[PDB]
Each structure stands twice: as C-alpha cells, then as structure tokens.
Design a protein around this ligand. Structure first.
Ligand SMILES: Cc1cc2nc3c(=O)[nH]c(=O)nc-3n(C[C@H](O)[C@H](O)[C@H](O)COP(=O)(O)OP(=O)(O)OC[C@H]3O[C@@H](n4cnc5c(N)ncnc54)[C@H](O)[C@@H]3O)c2cc1C
Ligand SMILES: NC(=O)C1=CN([C@@H]2O[C@H](COP(=O)(O)OP(=O)(O)OC[C@H]3O[C@@H](n4cnc5c(N)ncnc54)[C@H](OP(=O)(O)O)[C@@H]3O)[C@@H](O)[C@H]2O)C=CC1
Ligand SMILES: NC(=O)C1=CN([C@@H]2O[C@H](COP(=O)(O)OP(=O)(O)OC[C@H]3O[C@@H](n4cnc5c(N)ncnc54)[C@H](OP(=O)(O)O)[C@@H]3O)[C@@H](O)[C@H]2O)C=CC1
Ligand SMILES: NC(=O)C1=CN([C@@H]2O[C@H](COP(=O)(O)OP(=O)(O)OC[C@H]3O[C@@H](n4cnc5c(N)ncnc54)[C@H](OP(=O)(O)O)[C@@H]3O)[C@@H](O)[C@H]2O)C=CC1
Ligand SMILES: NC(=O)C1=CN([C@@H]2O[C@H](COP(=O)(O)OP(=O)(O)OC[C@H]3O[C@@H](n4cnc5c(N)ncnc54)[C@H](OP(=O)(O)O)[C@@H]3O)[C@@H](O)[C@H]2O)C=CC1
Ligand SMILES: [Cl-]
Ligand SMILES: [Cl-]
Lengths: 449, 450, 448, 448
C-alpha cells in the first residue's frame, strides 16, 4: 500500500510513526515545504523569553529518524496539487523547481494551518513579523535585538505569551486587538480582568477594542494606525488566529466555512482514502457535540495517531476534545476546559456558572494560595459545560480532571462528592474542585426556593 | 417534632449536624461528644509535631459554640453509655458529675468514628507507649517530644511514615518498626516504597521491618522494645497500627463487618432504618472492587456526614462509593495513589496487570524538570482501570484525583490514553504524563497478544 | 455678518434658529445635500415596525420655516471645499451642477456623520442597505413589504431596534455582529443576556462573534459569508456605526483620530472662525473628562444652541455629556448613562459595580414589576461613574436622575440618601435609586 | 451600652436595625404603645379604596424579626416619663398597668406625631374618626360599608387621597377645608384648579374656605356646621395635620414652636445623648436652609439610619430634604419637590416661576400625554427652588431628578442643557425637564 503525507510538523510525524508500526508493508512518502519536523512552536515564546537554553531541544524528532523506519521523506518539497480521482499528487522540489506526479493508495492531509494576515495596507512592511514556525522564531530572536518597542496584533494565547515574554525582558511592549478583553476566547471577565491588571502592573500597554488600519513604516520605525489611535513600535507580530492550509482540497472535500476538513470519527474525510489530522481538520467538540476548529497541538498528536490505527479500516474512534488549554503569565497558572459562560450563552445554550475563590489548602500550612475557579454547567441536566482555574499555585492538573468529567458527561452533583484525596499539603478535606461543584449545587438550590 | 441524637462529633458528626439543620429545620438535634472539642484536624498533628503549624487552633474548622449557634443540642463531655434500638433511647453519663440520663430519639446518627489498635502486649500501659489520634494525644506529644531524643513509631501506615519523617527533620533520632515488609505497603507497590525507604535511610531513620513487637520494659534509661529480630531502646513509642470502628455500642444490633464496622445501604442507613452511619464507624462501598470495605479517611466522613443529612428523612442522594484516594508529602516528594495496588488486587485474585513508567513531567528544554514515577493497575481483558499512583518532587497530587474520576466513571486504559488533556511546556509534554502512563499499558497489552 | 452653515439636519437646524434669534442681523446661508431637513432618524425603526401613522410627523422644522425666520435656505447643495485662511467655501448646486464661491465671516460645520461602510466584496449590492436619513427610510419602507428575510449587520442601538421592529412584523430576522454581545458599548453582560434571550424568545437568529467576509449575490437571494458560517437573506441593513462627515476640513482643524472636530467649551474648532456641532464634532465625556465620539441627537440639539450663543464671544459653556441613552425592546425599557464596568475596566479606571433586582414598587399593590439595576462607581472615591436600569415599567426618567448625579460628581453615598419621594403607586419608601446606591455602600464596606 | 427607643413605626424600625448591625454589642430596648410596627399609613387610602388585597403586606417588619436581631421588643408599652439628668425612662405595661424604670446610655426619640385634634362640640362622636393607625384603618374599613356619606375634613395629602378613594368606590364625598384650595401647600393654583375640577368631575362636594363650628350628632346622620353652611354625613374623617408627639421632653430639649425636636446635622438634640428621627424631629429644609416640619415617611427612614450611624460619634451627616412627595389622584400623577411660588412669595424670597404644558413625547408616536410643569427659582441667581409635574403619564421619577438638582443647588441654566437621553418612546429630543428649564431661561432674559 502506497501512502503519502502532506505536511509534517506534529500531525504528520505521529501519523508516520504510527502507520509504519501498524502497517510495515507500506510505502510511506511524506512531503513538507520545510526542512525540519516536530518543531514545538508552543515553546517559541519560552525561547524568546530566555526560558530555553538549547533551541534544538524543541524538536522531538528529525527527518533522519522517520526515514530510519522506511519513510520516503521528501523535505523541501511543496505538494502542488492532489487529484482525488486519479489518486496522484504533483510536487515540486524547492531546490531546483523539479515537478513530479506520483500515485497513491491513501493520502493523509496533515498540512496544518497558517497565520491569518488581514488586508491592511503597509502589511508588506518587513517590520511586521509572523509567528508560527522555526523560521519565524529565528527571525524574531535577532530582530528582537534592535527592536526595543514591540507590538503584538491580536488578543489570543500567542499575543498574551509574546507580550509577557517581551515584557519581562526590557521592551516597551504594546498589545492591540479588536477584542474587548485579553483572551476573551478562553476565560470569562473575572479571569481576564486580573491578567490585564498584571499586564498593566508590568508596564505593558493595552489598546483593546481597536482594530488596525494600515502600517506606514517610517525611518523612525513601523507606524500602526488603528481605528481609534496610532502607535509607533519597532516591530509588529501578527497573532490573530490560524486558518486551515486546505487549498489543494478546497471544493474537493467537505469542509467547514474556514476550510477545515470535516471527518468521521476515524479521521476519514469525505474521500474514503483521504485522511486529515491537526490544524487542517475540524475536531468533534464534546461540550457542543458539533464539529469545531480548535487548532491545538493536543489534537495533532491524537488525530495523527488515529489515522495510523484507521488507515486500512476503522479501528479506534476519536474521543472528541474539551479544548483543554492553559498557560503561565507572571507566575500565575491559567488553565481552562470546555465552554466559557460567555461562549455558551452566545450560542444560546442553557448555561449558568459559578466563580469561587478559596485557598487551595488550609490556612494553617506554612503557606497557601488563592485559587479563582469557574464552573459552567447546565442548570437543568446539571451537566458540567466547562471550567477554569487561575492561581500562582500550579492548578494546571485540575483542568485535566474537569476535562475527564466533561468526557464522561458528569454533573455538578458528581463532581460535588466524587472521591478526592485529602492532605493539608495539597488541599482541604474537600478538594477545591469538590467545593467548586458544591457552589453550583448551592447556586441551583437558591433557585429552587 | 423529629428528634435526632448524634453520637460522636469530629468530622462525620459535624457535617451531618450542619447538614440536617439546613435540610430539616423543624428538627431538634442533640449531639454528645466525650471530648470538649470538635472538628480536630488530626491529619495536621504530624505537621504540628513536625513544627509546620504555628497556630494550633487553626486545626479546628468549627466549635460547639458554632453548632449550638445554629440550634444543635450540643452536649460535650458526655459519654453515650448504651443505645436501645427498641424503645429508641440512649443512656449518657455527664463526665463532669457522673450524671446518667436516658433520652429518646426518632433518628440516631452513629458517627462514633474509630480508636487506635492497642495489642495485648507486655509492657503496654507503660506511659512511654503513647497514642496519636485526637487533640489530647497531640498536646501530650508536644510535651513528650521536648525530652525524648529517641522516638520509635510502631506501624507502617501513612502516620508512622508522616511521624518518622516529621521527627527526623526536627533533630530527633527516630526508628521505625513494623511487621510489614515495605513502608506503606498497603498503599504503594515496591517501586514506590523502595524509594521512600531510601529517603528514610538517607535521613538517618532506622528501619526495622518484618519484626513483631513482643514487649516494652520501662527503664530509667528509657523504654526497651523486644522484637523477635532484635531489641531497641527509645525514649518514646507511638502506636500506629491502624483503627478499629468504635461501634461496640451497637454490637449484635446492626449488621457489622468482621471488625465491627457498620454496614449501610446506598444512603448511609444501617440495617436499622432509623440508625444512620457515617465516617470511621461504617464501611464504604469500594468501587474498584464493588464490595464494602473499611477505608477510614476524613474524605469519607465529610461525604457520608453530608449524605446523612440529605437522607435522614428519606432516600434523596445516593452514595458514590470511594476509590480510597490518598497521598502524603515526604522529604519534599509528593506521593499519591488511588484504587488498587497490583499486590492488593493480585492478593485478591483479580485479573490484574501493571506498568511502571518514569518520565519527566515536562520537557527537558525547560529551565527545570522533575522525574515522575507512575504506576497503573488495570484489567488485561476488560482494560478497566483498577488503580494507580504517582510519585514526584513536583506536586502531582492532583493527578491522583484525575485517576479517581476515571475509576468512578469506569474508564479504560484506552480512554485515559487519548482523553483530551491540555499541553503547555510549563506543565507537561504534548501528551500529559497521564496519557503516557496509559499508553504504556496498551503497549503492555499489545505484546502478549502477539 | 456672513454666517455659513454646512448641513442642516439637527445641529444645523438649532444653531440657525439660535443664531437668527441671538443676532437677528447677520447673513446666514445653509447648504444641505438632501432636499429636506430636521428629520429624526430616531424614528426610522418605529415606522418600519409599523408605529407611525403619518411619517410627516418625523420632521419638526422645514426649509420654508428657516427661510421665514430670515435665513437663506439652499437645499440640494453639496459643499465641495472650504478655504479657511481665505475664509471661503465652494459649493455645487446639485440641481444643475453649477458651482459658486462665497465668503463667510463665521462658518458652522454641522455636516454630521455618515454610516460606516466596509471595504468588502459585494458591498455594492442593491440588497445591502444603509439606514441614516429620509431617503434610506423610504427605500427600506418600500423594499420591506415583500422581503421576508432581513439581516441586520451590527450589535448596536440601530441594529437592536431594527431587528425588533422587523421581528415584531413577521420577518426572518438575523443579526450578524462581530462583537460577542449586542450593544456591548451600553450595557454590561448582565443586561444584554436578558436582551439576547428576548431575541431568541422571538425567533431572531443571532450571529454574534462573527465577521462578514463578503456578500455574494446567490440564486435564491444574497449569501452572506463569515468566518464560521454563511447566511441567506433578502435584505441586509448595515448598522456598523457612524464616521464623522468632516473631510471638508481634514487637515485644516484639529481632529480626533476618527476625524471628529476637536472643539473647546464654546464649540470653537482649532480655527476660531469655524464652529462645529453634532455628529461632526467630538464631545467632552464628563465620566472621563476626555473627548469621545458620541453621535447622539441630544448632543446635536445642545451644541447647535451653543454655537448660536458663542458665535461672537464665548457666552455659554458646554457642560459635556454622560451619553445618556435608552430604548424600548420587547416590552422592556432599557436605559443607560455614563460608563459601564467593562468600559471602565477597559480604559484603566478604578471601578467596581453592584447589580440589584427589585420590584420598583411594593408587592401588595395590584401590580408591580422587577427592575434590573446597575451602578458603576469608583470603589475608593465613591464617585458614580455610570448606571443602567431595565424593567417592563417605564424607568426611562431614572436614567436622567443619574446623569444629574454624574454631572455634579455625586457619590454613592449622596445617591444612597438623597431625598426622593415615596408613595406606593410609584416606589417603596426608599426609591430604587436610593436602594441601588445603598447596595453599593454595602459592597464598599464589605471589602474594608 | 444601653439604648432605649421610644416608638417603633418606621424611623424606630430603621434606627433599630442600623444599631443592631453597626453595634451588635449595645443593649437595645424599644417601646411601642401599639401592638404592631412598620405599618405603612400611606396604604390606608389604597386599602380603603379596595386597591390593596392583603393588608398583611402593609407591614414590612415585625417585633419577632426585630427581636431575632438582638433587640428587646416591649410591645404595648407607654413610656410615662423621661429623666435626662438621671438618664432613665419610666415605662408602663398596658397589659397589666405595671410600671418599672430603666437606665439608658443613649435614647432614640422616635415618638412620631399625632393627628391634630380640633377642640369642637361633637368631636366626641363615634362618627368622627382619625386616620393614622393600623387600628384606625380597621375601623375605617368596617364603617365605610354602611357609610354612604363620607366627609373629609382637611385640604392636604390625606384628605385628597381619601376623598378620591371613597369617591371612586361609590360614596357621597364632601371635602371641607379652611384652606381656600386643596393642597395649597404643595402645588400652585395652576395645578389645584385641575385637581379641584377633577373632584367636581367625579361628584365630590368641595367646601373650601370654611371652618367647622361643631358636629351635630343625630339619628339619620351627624350634621356638620361651618361658618358658611351645614352638612349631614354618616362619617367624617379628620386629616387637618400632624403634631409632634414629643411631650416626654417638653422643656428638656430645644423644640420648634410646634414641639419638633431640634437636632443637629447628626440627628442629636440639645441633649447630646438623645437622638430624634421622623415625625418627632424638624428637618433642615435645603431650599430655604431653615428648620421646618415635614412629617414624611421618606424623612423617617433616612433619619433612623443616621441615628445608628452617628449613635456613638458623628459619622454621617444629614443631607437635608426637598420634601419630595407625590400622589395618584384619579388618572393623573402629581409630584412636587421644593418650594411653590406662593410659599416662596410668603416667606420673603426672591422667586419667580414658569408654567409649561407639553406632550411628554413626540406626537407622531401612537399616543402621548400633556404634562403640566412648574419650576420655581431665583430670578437673579437662577437657583432652582422647587418644581412640580402633573400628567396621565407616570412622571413620578422626574420629581426625584429635581430634588437632586435642588440638592446640588443647580440653576435653570444647568437643567436647561444638562444631558438627558432622547428616544421617541420616552421624550422629545430635549427632555421635557430641559424644556421646562429652557422656559425659565426665556423669562429672565425677557426682563433683562
Ligand atoms: C436610525 C438612526 C437612529 C437614531 N436614533 C437615536 C435616538 O434614538 N436617540 C439619540 O439621541 N440619537 C439617535 N441617533 C443619532 C442622531 O440621529 C444623530 O446623532 C443626529 O442625526 C446628528 O445630528 P447632526 O445634524 O449633527 O448630524 P446629521 O444628522 O448626521 O446631519 C448631517 C448633515 O450634514 C449634510 N452634509 C454633510 N456634508 C455636506 C456637504 N458637503 N454639503 C452639504 N451638506 C452636507 C448632510 O446632508 C447631513 O444632512 C440615530 C441615528 C440613526 C441613523
Ligand atoms: N498554550 C496554548 O495552548 C496555546 C495554544 N495556541 C493555539 O494556536 C492557535 C493560534 O494561536 P493564536 O494566534 O493565539 O490564535 P488565537 O485564536 O488563540 O488568538 C487570536 C486572537 O486574535 C484576535 N484577532 C483576530 N483577528 C484580529 C484582527 N484582525 N485584529 C485584532 N485582533 C484579532 C481574536 O480575538 P476575537 O476572536 O475576539 O476577534 C483572537 O482572540 C490557537 O487556535 C490556539 O488554540 C496558541 C498559543 C498558545
Ligand atoms: N495521608 C493519608 O492519606 C493518611 C491517612 N490516614 C488514614 O488513617 C487511618 C489510620 O492510619 P494507620 O494508623 O496508618 O492505619 P493503616 O492500616 O493505614 O496502617 C497501619 C499499618 O501498620 C501495620 N501494622 C498493623 N498492626 C501491626 C502490629 N501489631 N505490629 C506492627 N505493624 C502493624 C500494618 O502493616 P501490614 O498490613 O503490612 O501488617 C498496616 O499497614 C488509615 O485508614 C489511613 O488511611 C492517616 C494518616 C494520613
Ligand atoms: N436610542 C439611541 O440612543 C440610539 C442612538 N444611536 C446613535 O447613533 C449612532 C449610530 O448607531 P449604531 O448604528 O447603533 O452604531 P453603534 O456604534 O451604536 O453600533 C455599532 C455596533 O456594531 C458593532 N460592529 C462594528 N463594526 C462591525 C463589523 N465590521 N462587523 C460586525 N459588527 C460590527 C459594534 O460592536 P463592537 O463595538 O463591540 O465591535 C457596535 O456595538 C451611534 O453613535 C449611537 O449613539 C443610534 C440608534 C439609537
Ligand atoms: N403621599 C404623601 O407624601 C403623603 C404625605 N402625608 C404627610 O403626612 C402628614 C399628615 O398629613 P395630613 O394630616 O393630610 O396633613 P396635610 O399637610 O397632608 O394636609 C392637612 C391640610 O389640612 C388643612 N387644615 C388644617 N386645619 C384645618 C381645619 N381646622 N379645617 C380645615 N382644614 C384644615 C391645612 O391647610 P392649610 O395649611 O392651607 O390651612 C393643611 O394643608 C403631612 O405632613 C404630610 O406631609 C400625608 C399623606 C400623603
Ligand atoms: Cl513484595
Ligand atoms: Cl463582557
């Protein structure tokens, strides 16, 4: 069986290794516009912030490793087209513009995504960088040497990380986005208000509710004009989302409005021999049980695995995702999973939430820390619809506990009393997650009288 | 109208008290407690002993004034002498004047808890042999410590471990003795307990295992302990050999296990429909085995204490069972577990297998990282997860609760292997260390098929 | 004295009457592109929803009226250029393209605003409609008797009211807004959730948190594409906001980053001989003491009067504004003034908030209604920064009382105790405004 | 700390709760002749007109709740003496006539007021009734059933309410008033003419400018004789006014000529250890900045909270009052605040007024209502002194907007232009309050 892989960062890497372990009698050929694989862009910000001392340690594999098991790995190759009918791909070597067309028995679309770039005059400016791959990274390190004033466009995870990183390293940092509050897509106001006061306490300038219009690169730097003001920075970084790199298959496979490849529960697109995984596909979102586009490295490794398991026939079903996510900002651990209250009612769902703030362990310990918590739930079925935790004590593991509850369709009543260890070194007699759910019950008890 | 009398009041009684009131306000609740204190965090003694509790009063989360402040007929310093399930009455003698009184009730709450295990050994009532459970024992251990350079803990549970570790860091010369083969063998397997022992030995703690204490002999030099394998002399010995349900008030009257622990239905109600049981005096449904068992943990007491309130009048909220989730911190190392151990499931003859994994909880390219030794116990046919544990100097305690939810929901090793879990280099690899743990299980099952 | 007035809708209409009465000797000339004046755009949604018998009532002044008062009225006239240093303006008679150049002593820039339009593909369609003036109203009034599907683009005041009018008159209403909450700029999330649910109760389809990529003329209608979906409608009404209509002076007087003319307390532009009022100028936002762009009719009528009074020498000062506003939606009266908590927290202001619901009058009365109230305030100075009220009972007036509170820099303690009448027909012993401020006092003391 | 409270209706109830909260240590003792508290005597007229349904709703507190909060609640007690120098109070149990004596550290004087009783022959008749008590209302409920002819003696708030109430439920209502026009104390003749005419609309006989000489008891009815006529009736209700019920301290603390206990900004009497709140005390009248007597429930609730606030030391200051009031007569809403033009002309104050009627919202709306407006002000400082509004539409809240204006000493110039929202559902572009002040602006410039 001849198998070809389009794109190879994380989704393609795991699929490659998986397909060769499950079907060693296969001829696997992978193409990638780049030269490397398995680069952890998730760790770029840490690298810029000075938290990474060896950059090659951000690669958990290499073209050599994949080709040691039998992978026909063609780096520097740009797949130019795929015809689902003749089952061939047209690729062009980037080292000499050599075009070729090969047939295949199965094709895996792991082409991922690409940053979203608006149609804003002045975009063409070189002082406006993108942030996605190891090439953008290596550019930022140097170009962040003589760029004292740096500006980030967007208000997502990347923008938050980049801003903090450049802020704790002696830069005049500015952050701009149409969002009303930072990281609105992941946390509710009570959380994002604390982060902004942090961003302000650390000198970062916040220009929210404003959308850029142009970029007039002067001899004094890059001049950004938003529809409410203008700012003068030395470098601007685009951090305003991802869009699936699904041009080759547009109109050729069922997609979402953004170009995300719809799939069944075994990673098969509408073309029964074309698979997708990662930033190029749409994941089943359990909180809504409807497909969604949530580009996360977690979906790329899992989806990449299932492809190998299901290449020849259906074997293991995708478990969907709660979109569990989190990060560290100014020593605070900020994690969440599932729906935010805003994102649930914005979809008209029957949703309520509780925001609890309790110390994570008894006050008699030598030290303790406040943990701000949120629980989104159905007021009728009592089904948990998501949660979030913020604390200088690493509460990140709790978000994965909430993820399990959502995966298992658990209610606030389940979480209110589910067994959880107790030890003053760790929590109160009731783990802070139990207490959180018991507030949901108390909330619903108030409404039942 | 409805007369409720609570027997005992540490944790299982307190919550039940606060619960009944808010749930059944037109009720007259009377509670008797031999002590003068309630809600004493005994689980903070070693921390107090170890010197990490400066304000010992912060170890109580309530007080009789509070309960009476809500309307509880609070009666401290009273010992319930007997209970008649027929005429529905109790006899109690005031400890301040030996005044007996027989009172009636419509419902009884049997939250009498437990008491340490004191064996028939010679030289036992020697004051150099002390107990550790309530606020009275801790206050004495505070005094008996100042003039007890050498200290011996008898047992091999979490307490003996917590106490041995606490004293060793405070300058004492400590020795540990127990019939067990490995420290905390009923909670962790060999790969974990061997590292714990290495810490002890690395901290000067003298470990004497497999030895059966046979006598204590008072001596102006101190106390001399005789074990079939040797004889030691310490200044103080602490009984840490487990609990026994303090239920003999109801013997022959309600269904109890071999150790006198009360059996309850799914709503904490004993075999007598008007006698509820919560906490260390009852047996809990153990989900990993779906049988009744004796897991005396403060987690059960508060939960069962609550359930007694919502159900005191009629079945309202079913008990969810327990996985026995527990864990401690020994020498800057987080040790937690939940469910069955491999040996404990094997010792029960269940289809069980296990993987032991050790990986850094987050990628090495981070400025720091710590190894996390992990263990998963699962059914090799059903692939159902039966138990697990983690050990690391990184606080992995919350992952034990994650495993608890998988067991509660009867999750398999495949579910845990691919369940969505966040990734951020500050916390873990692209796959959380729990996903990795479960994927080693699958790997273990993917071989014996071939 | 020669006085030139550009545009005459509301601000221009007031400055003219004021000027001709303040100094009934000057020569006043007013140029207006349209053929009518004094048209209340704030009545478009109420007709479209079928509530205005004779739409001739939406006009309160007229050219003949202004020319009788002594002004020279030139309807259908585009002003093609203003020459400040020369103090001249060049205009074209739209009726015959004829151009003339006239001199002025003073110029009044009442050019107002124009609806924001997106640089997009498909925006030129005849199914994409604007909604600002008399012409737009008749077009939407004519092309609405057949159009079953109607889509409003925007989450603001205009969009919310158009959706309500059409929805209440048998229409498939879809509101596509990029902001995640309808009318985010006026009410914190607590008020809007009831509003958004009110729309769902009435079958309106809300496409919030989406941006329209383009409009595409499809077979069975016009297809609207966003980043998360695509929508089919017969008519798309743009309610995305307004932009100052001040290109005539772009680079000739001090302007805000959006083109709004920056004035002083007497409405004088950076050029003294040039006054501005209404949607062409900025306004002093008393809550912050900064200049905001608050294009409300209340500001046009007020500044127009001040132009006519400060035309020679600064006579009366501008008081600023708290941007008091409100509307009626599905039986509910919804009013606001000053800042919300989100905007306050957004602009780096020390602010907290209390939310309170209460039956505006005693329950023993034959009837009563709950009132959802919000008060935004500085938690350490106690000063009131803004407030909002919502109820099926007409609480509109209470938004004016708050404005006077903000105008005088009152505190929650002032509002908590200030004298307010009591009679069971109207309120409780303590007026709900008193009760609203008292709850703010408790929160202040709770965290002390 | 020992605290004794005399009388517990409204001011007493609030001072109690404020003391128990801010001082859960002091010892609170309260005495009340009656067997209830918190009864709103403002609902009797509604309940007599059958507009209330469960008079148990006219009680917002109770002895139990107050005792459950930590106070000693002595119901059915008639304190018979106060000894400041000794700091004791002699009380008497009404259930057994017993008598004791208690010491106090602070005593709150909330004895309220009592209906002015006229020295008249026949004033003993059981057909002559009062109307201030919960018991009073019960006797008024029983009587009305067999009472076709009800006579109201007075020209103020209570009489007008009761007359309208009984007139709308099928009674022969006669109103006798020494005053020449009903409610001369709150509204100028321009408003009372409509009200007096309204009564003549609904078959209510007005006896204005007359004084009763006697009540002649008879079989077919009690005949009432005045200096100008005679009237037979089945029931005559007295509502001539209120008098301070403060004899316990006559000669022990400063008082107004009517007995009102003079307090300072912190509600303390001439004796520093005795507070006064409610109908027992005079209040600082902001419009005049003098002490006056206005027994309003709004006065009592505010002052009560101030006693518990400054009980130990002056903490919060009394902000004065505009005596904002209002009632619902037939199909109209009449509200007032501050001074009338007549009341100002009678006290030697620079005062002018304007009167403006106007449809409260645009006529193009489906419906609108005229609004009669009054604004009293100083014609040379432009300071606002008072105001009033009347209209079928609920303009109640606008009386509170004016009190804030008076509170902050604003002028007609502030009100003429201060920001106020516009929306046809609510008002014209300029709020009718703005229009009113603008009317006042035109009269000063008409004489400058
Ligand atoms: C549907 C809609 C509903 C609204 N509802 C409310 C409400 O309920 N409450 C409220 O307070 N506000 C409301 N507003 C806002 C209010 O209508 C505006 O703020 C008000 O119209 C501004 O008055 P203006 O005269 O200063 O400017 P405009 O009304 O915008 O008039 C500007 C004039 O300038 C003319 N002009 C521009 N350039 C030239 C030129 N070169 N030559 C000649 N003439 C020129 C234009 O023809 C135009 O007529 C609403 C607005 C809209 C569109
Ligand atoms: N720790 C983690 O797990 C991390 C995960 N990621 C993942 O990688 C992907 C890409 O990251 P990122 O770039 O942060 O994308 P995100 O979606 O996380 O953030 C993009 C943000 O930019 C805003 N935005 C979009 N367009 C514009 C515009 N024209 N002007 C101003 N602001 C705009 C959006 O706000 P609005 O939607 O309100 O318009 C949005 O919140 C994400 O999908 C995320 O899942 C990235 C970084 C860290
Ligand atoms: N962090 C936590 O979770 C903590 C939990 N607890 C709970 O409190 C309860 C009491 O704890 P603990 O006292 O440890 O009870 P445990 O049963 O947990 O520990 C007692 C141990 O002592 C050994 N032992 C018993 N009898 C003798 C004897 N005569 N001579 C020598 N050794 C003996 C047993 O080992 P073997 O079985 O090998 O013979 C047994 O493992 C437990 O249920 C525990 O779960 C208490 C403290 C901390
Ligand atoms: N009753 C009243 O007082 C009324 C007053 N007015 C006034 O008239 C003027 C015009 O009103 P209106 O049309 O409501 O203007 P508004 O600014 O009030 O409303 C525009 C709304 O549309 C949203 N929006 C902006 N751009 C886009 C886009 N590209 N895609 C999707 N949504 C977008 C904005 O949300 P976000 O800002 O969160 O992005 C904003 O809330 C306003 O200044 C207003 O003050 C109008 C009607 C009634
Ligand atoms: N909704 C509200 O706010 C209400 C408030 N109240 C308050 O309660 C208090 C008591 O009310 P009420 O007793 O009605 O007093 P009011 O002030 O309401 O009315 C009493 C009126 O009766 C007239 N009067 C006095 N003596 C005689 C007499 N011998 N013969 C005929 N007429 C006479 C007086 O007119 P003149 O002074 O012109 O001689 C006086 O204005 C008032 O102070 C009032 O403020 C009462 C009812 C409703
Ligand atoms: Cl072993
Ligand atoms: Cl929000």
């Amino acid at each position: 069986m001849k198998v070809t892989v389009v794109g190879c960062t994380h989704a393609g890497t795991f699929a490659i290794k998986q397909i060769l372990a499950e079907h060693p009698d296969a001829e696997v050929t992978v193409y990638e516009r780049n030269d490397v694989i398995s680069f952890l862009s998730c760790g770029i910000a840490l690298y810029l912030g000075g938290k990474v001392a060896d950059p090659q340690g951000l690669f958990y594999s290499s073209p050599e490793e994949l080709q040691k098991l039998g992978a026909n790995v063609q780096m520097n190759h740009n797949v130019l087209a795929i015809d689902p009918d003749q089952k061939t791909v047209t690729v062009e070597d980037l080292t000499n513009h050599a075009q070729t067309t090969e047939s295949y028995d199965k094709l895996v679309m792991t082409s991922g995504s690409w940053p979203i770039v608006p149609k804003i005059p002045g975009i063409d400016s070189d002082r406006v960088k993108l942030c996605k791959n190891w090439a953008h990274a290596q550019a930022l390190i140097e170009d962040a040497k003589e760029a004292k004033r740096i500006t980030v466009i967007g208000a997502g995870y990347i923008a938050a990380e980049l801003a903090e990183a450049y802020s704790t390293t002696g830069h005049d940092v500015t952050l701009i986005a149409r969002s009303a509050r930072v990281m609105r897509k992941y946390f509710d106001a009570d959380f994002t208000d604390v982060i902004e006061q942090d961003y302000r306490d650390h000198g970062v300038q916040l220009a929210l509710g404003e959308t850029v219009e142009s970029f007039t690169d002067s001899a004094t730097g890059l001049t950004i004009k938003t529809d409410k003001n203008s700012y003068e920075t030395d470098l601007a970084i685009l951090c305003i989302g991802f869009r699936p790199n699904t041009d080759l298959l547009k109109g050729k496979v069922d997609m979402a409005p953004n170009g995300a490849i719809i799939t069944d529960d075994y990673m098969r697109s509408s073309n029964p021999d074309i698979f997708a995984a990662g930033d190029s596909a749409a994941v089943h979102y359990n909180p809504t049980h409807q497909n969604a586009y949530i580009p996360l490295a977690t979906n790329a490794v899992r989806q990449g695995i299932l492809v190998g398991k299901n290449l020849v026939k259906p074997t293991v079903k995708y478990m969907g995702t709660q979109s569990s996510s989190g990060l560290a900002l100014y020593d605070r651990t900020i994690v969440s999973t599932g729906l935010t209250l805003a994102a649930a009612k914005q979809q008209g769902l029957n949703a309520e939430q509780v925001i609890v703030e309790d110390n994570y362990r008894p006050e008699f310990m030598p030290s303790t820390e406040p943990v701000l918590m949120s629980l989104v739930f159905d007021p009728d079925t009592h089904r948990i619809l998501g949660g979030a935790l913020m604390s200088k004590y690493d509460v990140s593991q709790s978000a994965n506990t909430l993820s399990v509850c959502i995966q298992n369709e658990n209610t606030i009543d389940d979480l209110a009393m589910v067994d959880m260890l107790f030890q003053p070194n760790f929590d109160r007699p009731f783990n802070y997650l139990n207490i959180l759910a018991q507030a949901a019950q108390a909330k619903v008890a108030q409404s039942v009288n």
